[PDB]
Amino acid sequence: RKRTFAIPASRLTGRLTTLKSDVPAADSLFWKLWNGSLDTAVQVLQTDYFKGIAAGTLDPNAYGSLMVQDGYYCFRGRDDYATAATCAQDETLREFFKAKAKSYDEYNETYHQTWHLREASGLIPGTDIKDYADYEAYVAGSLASPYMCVVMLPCEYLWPWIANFLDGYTPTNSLYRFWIEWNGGTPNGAYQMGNMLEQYRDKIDEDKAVEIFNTAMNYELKVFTSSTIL
Amino acid sequence: KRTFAIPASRLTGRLTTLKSDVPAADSLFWKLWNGSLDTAVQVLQTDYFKGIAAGTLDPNAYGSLMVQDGYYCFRGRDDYATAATCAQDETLREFFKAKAKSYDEYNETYHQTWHLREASGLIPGTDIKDYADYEAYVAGSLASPYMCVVMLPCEYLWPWIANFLDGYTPTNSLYRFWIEWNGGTPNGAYQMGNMLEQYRDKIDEDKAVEIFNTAMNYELKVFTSSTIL
Amino acid sequence: RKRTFAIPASRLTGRLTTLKSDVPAADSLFWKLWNGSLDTAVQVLQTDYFKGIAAGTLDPNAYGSLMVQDGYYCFRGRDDYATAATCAQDETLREFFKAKAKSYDEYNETYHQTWHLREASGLIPGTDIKDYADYEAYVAGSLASPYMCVVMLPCEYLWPWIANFLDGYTPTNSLYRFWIEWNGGTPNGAYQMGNMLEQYRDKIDEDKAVEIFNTAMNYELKVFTSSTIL
Amino acid sequence: KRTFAIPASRLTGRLTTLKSDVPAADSLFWKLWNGSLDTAVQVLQTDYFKGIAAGTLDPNAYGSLMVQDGYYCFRGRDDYATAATCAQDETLREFFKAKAKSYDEYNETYHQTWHLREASGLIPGTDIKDYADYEAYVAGSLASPYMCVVMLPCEYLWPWIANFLDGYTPTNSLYRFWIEWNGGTPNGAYQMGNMLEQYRDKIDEDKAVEIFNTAMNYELKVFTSSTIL
Amino acid sequence: RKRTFAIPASRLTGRLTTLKSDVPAADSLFWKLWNGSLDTAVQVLQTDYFKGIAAGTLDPNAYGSLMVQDGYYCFRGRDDYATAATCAQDETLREFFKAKAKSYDEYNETYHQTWHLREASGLIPGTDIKDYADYEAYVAGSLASPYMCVVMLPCEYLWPWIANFLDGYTPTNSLYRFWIEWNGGTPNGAYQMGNMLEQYRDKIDEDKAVEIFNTAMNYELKVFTSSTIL
Amino acid sequence: RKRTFAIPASRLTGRLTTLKSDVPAADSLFWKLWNGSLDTAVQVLQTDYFKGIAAGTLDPNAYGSLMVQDGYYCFRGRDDYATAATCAQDETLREFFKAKAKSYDEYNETYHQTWHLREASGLIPGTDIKDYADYEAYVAGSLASPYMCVVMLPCEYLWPWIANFLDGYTPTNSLYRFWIEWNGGTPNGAYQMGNMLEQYRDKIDEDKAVEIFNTAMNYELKVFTSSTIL
Ligand SMILES: [K+]
Ligand SMILES: [K+]
Ligand SMILES: [K+]
Ligand SMILES: [K+]
Ligand SMILES: [K+]
Ligand SMILES: [K+]
Ligand SMILES: [K+]
């Protein structure tokens, strides 16, 4: 129910035993990526979707339609981590990606059980979510391993960031307050992945990372924008 | 607008004279409904409908049920196609074919707004699975007119609930749309009631009562379980 | 304040010693009568009166004007049970009707004390309540004894049935929430009279009973309908 | 609209020139009102009127008091008839007769909307009974002009309260109708104040002050006890 | 922020040692003054200002603009008490006025610190507050000492009286509820000054006192009335 | 009571005849400055002040106390533009600064009339507003003319930007909705000044401009943060 894809302490084993979830350092690639896309994040806050969450007036049809599409996205994201693990040449990253896939499986129980969704092939994704998922699949299958951490970061950090921003704008007794509770708090999953990524910073092109990260951020905006157009 | 009525443009052939006016007081339609009214009242007593009226229904419950209703409607369409294929006579063949088409039109909402591809891509809850299975059994194993009986509850109950809850559901409240989409004159139900009346002498009314009551009770079970997440 | 006309345990004496208040059996005349008029009960829920109760917006003038008329009705009802006792077929029903009259006297203290109503003659009933009270007097004075249990059942069962229905529709902090509390709960008075009536089922014409019961139910609907037309 | 004013059509005979304009500042009318203004303020501090303004007055308290006000107004009408009978002054005889008729007209609300037949059919609470008994005493045992004194509070206090509470009582609130029914220009009070001024020299003003203050204090007592159920 | 100008027990020294804060006797000049202006107080309750306080809808710009003007008023009031001390030929009244000046200094810290107002000369008073402050300065500097107690009484008693009246009309969770809490309760300052005044009652003309008190009360009304006209 | 410091068409005379108020180009120094401080702007949205505005629950004392300090700030800002004009390095900037001082005079009528504030010397500014005002005076009097456009831009652009952000989070019937109406819409004043600045871009150090702009933005954050600490 708590939306997290963090690797829990019990599964920080093998090469992952020392992986930390503390806030990445200010000079990290994590913050460099996030700080460069902040204008996009602010635009997400200006969507009708999030104005609806804060006001408690989001059309429940918009909420649910988006949720089904997020199911599609998360089902495919799990598969992408599995693909990344298969493509990893580095054993640490292989273990990391295998653990992330498992974190997705656990979260995805919500989509199977509460939302009654069997699998991605049973859904007809909207254009934006399809394009976004296709992009992640391409990164996972065709680009070097550390870029997988880059492309998946926005969906792990943006949601908590939105929740923590909207917390003080969303009354405790309002209908979508649960969104804040389920997504807010410390973004330990994102931090964890940012700390993994920092270890491979010297093995990638940072300009390419920026482009990949910004593309995924733009997809988040497109998806939230289109979610209320029914 | 949730309707499965056959529109005027498709009342052709043997369906040309089929009417949508309120069935007569002595009709099998009202006999069936009247006998399950206690069940309908219990549907109004569900947390689901208290939540609709109050505007406080958990959006996760609303959506979770909607996905299952998609499953139900996809299978309902198939049941009508099954019933048409093995139909008795040509009037029912045409009627059931036209109903299947009305379901196809309505089901665009599940495909487009709710992004659901097909029934096999969903994992139904137990109650909706058992209900759908029961309608499939009626369509494929019982005489044709019983298909009108088993499908009538979903066509009449929903507008009836909406028309009841209309004056309890403020126009500015979050789930007011449910009243607007489901309420008004239940022309689809009446139309099928009027079709059924023409085959009344060809069925066992005790059996029809049992079938109708089973379906009504599935509606209650589905709405009851919808808010237990 | 608790609206009940049940005979309490302390007055279940003599021939009434073994009279029970448990739910009548499914094949009882009680359920046969109620089930046949359920469409009318649903229409009572559709009145502006009950929409107003649930929403907390019923005009206090409508609430009060109907209450005065219910005082008239209950004052007369008490006399109708006294009349029924006087005409009673047999000693058990004589005792039952005497005990019911006393239950009415006990409840009617609310009309004397809180509503400042002296007696029926001091009120000018509306048409619907007058007709309804006239019908009950007719049954009490002109028809066989067990029919008195039939005609009086709607007012004992309908009101708790309405309260129990509207309970989950009427917020606990709303202005007419008291209606739910005062009228809801187990309809023991109705059950008790249903159980009395079952014992005389063979002594009456059930079609005539249905007719009488449905007339009373229809008067309840007419009264609630007219209550908000001021 | 709660008014006991004598309408223009019945300002005939000796009443032809009676005016409803605001009494002059030096009038007995204002002298009486100004001396009891603390009591009027305490009426505004009752739970009754705090409930009116907030929309939260218990409907049972509202109704319970309304029945008692019916009793009071039925009796008030009889008091004016008694005052007409006992008046040897012709103008006051006509005035009281016309006031009795104004009460009859208003009292149709109690007969018709509240279904109350007559005073003898009601059991007044203690405060209302004492207040009505006091008015009946003034009407039947004191000099005629004192009747104008004792009846003024109920005619002026209620509009005054309504006009005070108007900006405190939202237009959409449940008891807003109280403001609309009782508020506006207190023409009936002014009319009686203007009648009273003409007999000022024929009464003891200290006694008038006592009588007026007694009635005002009964108003306070009645409103205070109305919400203790 | 508790709005009081009372002389606290610690400063009831010298000739003020025995000065009491109990409710003045019914025959006191204090109550004579108040009772004669009660119509004006009622009209203060009829202002849009207080209707706004009770409803929680007073324009925050009206609230603040008036507060600045009240700062001006209180700064000048403090000066008036110092002037009155200077003109007092009676020693007890000299001490009383000096102590009042100090109570104003203490209260006035709210205007310096919270509202960032330096001094009266830095403000541009509206016409009504200017006129009212000018009238108090005139009384202080040109009329016999005890009249200063008369002219300053309305601002000490009227506000608590209003707060205590509106308490039961102002929900505890409403935006301006603080007004009630800061001004309401026992008007000990007013009572104290009333008790001081009563000792000099024989030294003044009561008709003149009525005139002065009523003038001040009328200014209070004018000020509250104009406060919401922006 | 529209908060604008734009030079209106009627005063676009002489060297200012062709000065435009269109949105500056994407490559402009104006957007470079704003884009670099966006994190600070987002932190302004996270203050209790703006959460209060949106929710309608901002303490009216906090609202008003800040308004008085803004009066101080605007009184001093007007003088800074007069100073900048006096030591303007060319006639275009002299005319521009003179025109801005006049726009400030026009807006400042709200502080004199509605808020009853005579002049800056009559106010005691809080620490943050004092430091901010001192910084602008320093820029005006000690740095090259075009830097005055830089340091004044935040107060002209940030407020509209906030209002336009909060518009869809602030219900139309809420108590502080007027803040959105008064500050929101097209930031024509800011654009106009950005377009003036662009003409002097080659005459200044952009790194210094960034520093100055960020300092002012940070003062805005400090001021809003401290406004609700009473
Ligand atoms: K979520
Ligand atoms: K599938
Ligand atoms: K629906
Ligand atoms: K009577
Ligand atoms: K009334
Ligand atoms: K100054
Ligand atoms: K230019």
PDB file of N, CA, C and O in Angstrom, chain A residues 162-192:
ATOM      1  N   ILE A 162       6.310  15.340  -4.695  1.00  0.00           N
ATOM      2  CA  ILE A 162       4.978  15.941  -4.857  1.00  0.00           C
ATOM      3  C   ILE A 162       4.171  15.824  -3.572  1.00  0.00           C
ATOM      4  O   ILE A 162       3.553  16.806  -3.140  1.00  0.00           O
ATOM      5  N   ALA A 163       4.171  14.631  -2.980  1.00  0.00           N
ATOM      6  CA  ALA A 163       3.412  14.381  -1.767  1.00  0.00           C
ATOM      7  C   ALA A 163       3.877  15.270  -0.653  1.00  0.00           C
ATOM      8  O   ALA A 163       3.078  15.821   0.100  1.00  0.00           O
ATOM      9  N   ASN A 164       5.182  15.389  -0.516  1.00  0.00           N
ATOM     10  CA  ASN A 164       5.705  16.204   0.576  1.00  0.00           C
ATOM     11  C   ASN A 164       5.466  17.683   0.365  1.00  0.00           C
ATOM     12  O   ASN A 164       5.348  18.433   1.329  1.00  0.00           O
ATOM     13  N   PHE A 165       5.411  18.103  -0.899  1.00  0.00           N
ATOM     14  CA  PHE A 165       5.048  19.492  -1.240  1.00  0.00           C
ATOM     15  C   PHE A 165       3.572  19.741  -0.904  1.00  0.00           C
ATOM     16  O   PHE A 165       3.243  20.780  -0.308  1.00  0.00           O
ATOM     17  N   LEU A 166       2.693  18.812  -1.307  1.00  0.00           N
ATOM     18  CA  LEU A 166       1.239  18.993  -1.172  1.00  0.00           C
ATOM     19  C   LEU A 166       0.685  18.712   0.216  1.00  0.00           C
ATOM     20  O   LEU A 166      -0.472  19.012   0.535  1.00  0.00           O
ATOM     21  N   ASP A 167       1.514  18.129   1.060  1.00  0.00           N
ATOM     22  CA  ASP A 167       1.107  17.770   2.419  1.00  0.00           C
ATOM     23  C   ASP A 167       0.407  18.942   3.126  1.00  0.00           C
ATOM     24  O   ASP A 167      -0.701  18.826   3.608  1.00  0.00           O
ATOM     25  N   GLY A 168       1.071  20.082   3.157  1.00  0.00           N
ATOM     26  CA  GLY A 168       0.545  21.281   3.805  1.00  0.00           C
ATOM     27  C   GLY A 168      -0.551  21.991   3.021  1.00  0.00           C
ATOM     28  O   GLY A 168      -1.075  23.009   3.475  1.00  0.00           O
ATOM     29  N   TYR A 169      -0.896  21.470   1.843  1.00  0.00           N
ATOM     30  CA  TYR A 169      -1.998  22.004   1.038  1.00  0.00           C
ATOM     31  C   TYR A 169      -3.199  21.077   0.981  1.00  0.00           C
ATOM     32  O   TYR A 169      -4.194  21.438   0.359  1.00  0.00           O
ATOM     33  N   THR A 170      -3.096  19.895   1.595  1.00  0.00           N
ATOM     34  CA  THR A 170      -4.095  18.848   1.471  1.00  0.00           C
ATOM     35  C   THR A 170      -4.645  18.548   2.838  1.00  0.00           C
ATOM     36  O   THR A 170      -3.961  17.917   3.634  1.00  0.00           O
ATOM     37  N   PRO A 171      -5.865  19.016   3.131  1.00  0.00           N
ATOM     38  CA  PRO A 171      -6.461  18.796   4.473  1.00  0.00           C
ATOM     39  C   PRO A 171      -6.547  17.331   4.878  1.00  0.00           C
ATOM     40  O   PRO A 171      -6.784  16.456   4.053  1.00  0.00           O
ATOM     41  N   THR A 172      -6.308  17.075   6.149  1.00  0.00           N
ATOM     42  CA  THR A 172      -6.263  15.730   6.743  1.00  0.00           C
ATOM     43  C   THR A 172      -7.559  14.958   6.579  1.00  0.00           C
ATOM     44  O   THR A 172      -7.539  13.723   6.480  1.00  0.00           O
ATOM     45  N   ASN A 173      -8.660  15.680   6.488  1.00  0.00           N
ATOM     46  CA  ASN A 173      -9.949  15.056   6.324  1.00  0.00           C
ATOM     47  C   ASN A 173     -10.455  15.041   4.887  1.00  0.00           C
ATOM     48  O   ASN A 173     -11.617  14.716   4.656  1.00  0.00           O
ATOM     49  N   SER A 174      -9.603  15.374   3.919  1.00  0.00           N
ATOM     50  CA  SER A 174     -10.059  15.483   2.529  1.00  0.00           C
ATOM     51  C   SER A 174      -9.956  14.111   1.831  1.00  0.00           C
ATOM     52  O   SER A 174      -9.229  13.227   2.295  1.00  0.00           O
ATOM     53  N   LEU A 175     -10.683  13.944   0.724  1.00  0.00           N
ATOM     54  CA  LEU A 175     -10.930  12.616   0.189  1.00  0.00           C
ATOM     55  C   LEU A 175      -9.672  11.928  -0.344  1.00  0.00           C
ATOM     56  O   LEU A 175      -9.563  10.715  -0.283  1.00  0.00           O
ATOM     57  N   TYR A 176      -8.737  12.697  -0.879  1.00  0.00           N
ATOM     58  CA  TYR A 176      -7.504  12.127  -1.450  1.00  0.00           C
ATOM     59  C   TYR A 176      -6.298  12.312  -0.559  1.00  0.00           C
ATOM     60  O   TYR A 176      -5.154  12.190  -1.003  1.00  0.00           O
ATOM     61  N   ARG A 177      -6.551  12.604   0.712  1.00  0.00           N
ATOM     62  CA  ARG A 177      -5.459  12.736   1.659  1.00  0.00           C
ATOM     63  C   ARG A 177      -4.589  11.499   1.703  1.00  0.00           C
ATOM     64  O   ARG A 177      -3.375  11.609   1.871  1.00  0.00           O
ATOM     65  N   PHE A 178      -5.196  10.327   1.501  1.00  0.00           N
ATOM     66  CA  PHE A 178      -4.470   9.075   1.450  1.00  0.00           C
ATOM     67  C   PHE A 178      -3.307   9.120   0.465  1.00  0.00           C
ATOM     68  O   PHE A 178      -2.308   8.412   0.658  1.00  0.00           O
ATOM     69  N   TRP A 179      -3.421   9.916  -0.606  1.00  0.00           N
ATOM     70  CA  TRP A 179      -2.331  10.010  -1.596  1.00  0.00           C
ATOM     71  C   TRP A 179      -1.050  10.529  -0.960  1.00  0.00           C
ATOM     72  O   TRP A 179       0.068  10.063  -1.204  1.00  0.00           O
ATOM     73  N   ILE A 180      -1.237  11.524  -0.116  1.00  0.00           N
ATOM     74  CA  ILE A 180      -0.128  12.101   0.630  1.00  0.00           C
ATOM     75  C   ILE A 180       0.532  11.069   1.538  1.00  0.00           C
ATOM     76  O   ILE A 180       1.753  10.955   1.553  1.00  0.00           O
ATOM     77  N   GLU A 181      -0.294  10.346   2.285  1.00  0.00           N
ATOM     78  CA  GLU A 181       0.182   9.356   3.247  1.00  0.00           C
ATOM     79  C   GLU A 181       0.887   8.192   2.573  1.00  0.00           C
ATOM     80  O   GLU A 181       1.910   7.731   3.061  1.00  0.00           O
ATOM     81  N   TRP A 182       0.357   7.734   1.453  1.00  0.00           N
ATOM     82  CA  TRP A 182       0.964   6.605   0.764  1.00  0.00           C
ATOM     83  C   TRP A 182       2.251   6.923   0.037  1.00  0.00           C
ATOM     84  O   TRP A 182       3.062   6.029  -0.182  1.00  0.00           O
ATOM     85  N   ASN A 183       2.433   8.177  -0.363  1.00  0.00           N
ATOM     86  CA  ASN A 183       3.599   8.557  -1.188  1.00  0.00           C
ATOM     87  C   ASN A 183       4.616   9.453  -0.512  1.00  0.00           C
ATOM     88  O   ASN A 183       5.722   9.587  -0.974  1.00  0.00           O
ATOM     89  N   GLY A 184       4.233  10.068   0.583  1.00  0.00           N
ATOM     90  CA  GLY A 184       5.069  11.003   1.262  1.00  0.00           C
ATOM     91  C   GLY A 184       6.028  10.355   2.244  1.00  0.00           C
ATOM     92  O   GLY A 184       6.105   9.136   2.389  1.00  0.00           O
ATOM     93  N   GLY A 185       6.779  11.203   2.903  1.00  0.00           N
ATOM     94  CA  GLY A 185       7.825  10.777   3.806  1.00  0.00           C
ATOM     95  C   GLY A 185       9.159  10.793   3.089  1.00  0.00           C
ATOM     96  O   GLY A 185       9.305  11.324   1.989  1.00  0.00           O
ATOM     97  N   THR A 186      10.124  10.178   3.735  1.00  0.00           N
ATOM     98  CA  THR A 186      11.490  10.116   3.259  1.00  0.00           C
ATOM     99  C   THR A 186      11.564   9.245   2.037  1.00  0.00           C
ATOM    100  O   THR A 186      11.140   8.112   2.085  1.00  0.00           O
ATOM    101  N   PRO A 187      12.130   9.752   0.947  1.00  0.00           N
ATOM    102  CA  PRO A 187      12.278   8.966  -0.300  1.00  0.00           C
ATOM    103  C   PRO A 187      13.465   8.007  -0.303  1.00  0.00           C
ATOM    104  O   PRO A 187      14.420   8.148  -1.096  1.00  0.00           O
ATOM    105  N   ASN A 188      13.407   7.030   0.581  1.00  0.00           N
ATOM    106  CA  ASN A 188      14.543   6.150   0.800  1.00  0.00           C
ATOM    107  C   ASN A 188      14.894   5.315  -0.430  1.00  0.00           C
ATOM    108  O   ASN A 188      16.070   5.069  -0.697  1.00  0.00           O
ATOM    109  N   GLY A 189      13.881   4.912  -1.188  1.00  0.00           N
ATOM    110  CA  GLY A 189      14.096   4.190  -2.437  1.00  0.00           C
ATOM    111  C   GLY A 189      14.896   4.990  -3.448  1.00  0.00           C
ATOM    112  O   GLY A 189      15.859   4.498  -4.052  1.00  0.00           O
ATOM    113  N   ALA A 190      14.498   6.234  -3.647  1.00  0.00           N
ATOM    114  CA  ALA A 190      15.218   7.099  -4.553  1.00  0.00           C
ATOM    115  C   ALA A 190      16.654   7.345  -4.086  1.00  0.00           C
ATOM    116  O   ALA A 190      17.593   7.284  -4.880  1.00  0.00           O
ATOM    117  N   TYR A 191      16.802   7.642  -2.805  1.00  0.00           N
ATOM    118  CA  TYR A 191      18.109   7.886  -2.229  1.00  0.00           C
ATOM    119  C   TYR A 191      19.030   6.665  -2.433  1.00  0.00           C
ATOM    120  O   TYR A 191      20.179   6.783  -2.854  1.00  0.00           O
ATOM    121  N   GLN A 192      18.491   5.498  -2.123  1.00  0.00           N
ATOM    122  CA  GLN A 192      19.205   4.260  -2.261  1.00  0.00           C
ATOM    123  C   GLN A 192      19.744   4.092  -3.686  1.00  0.00           C
ATOM    124  O   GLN A 192      20.925   3.745  -3.904  1.00  0.00           O
TER     125      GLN A 192
END
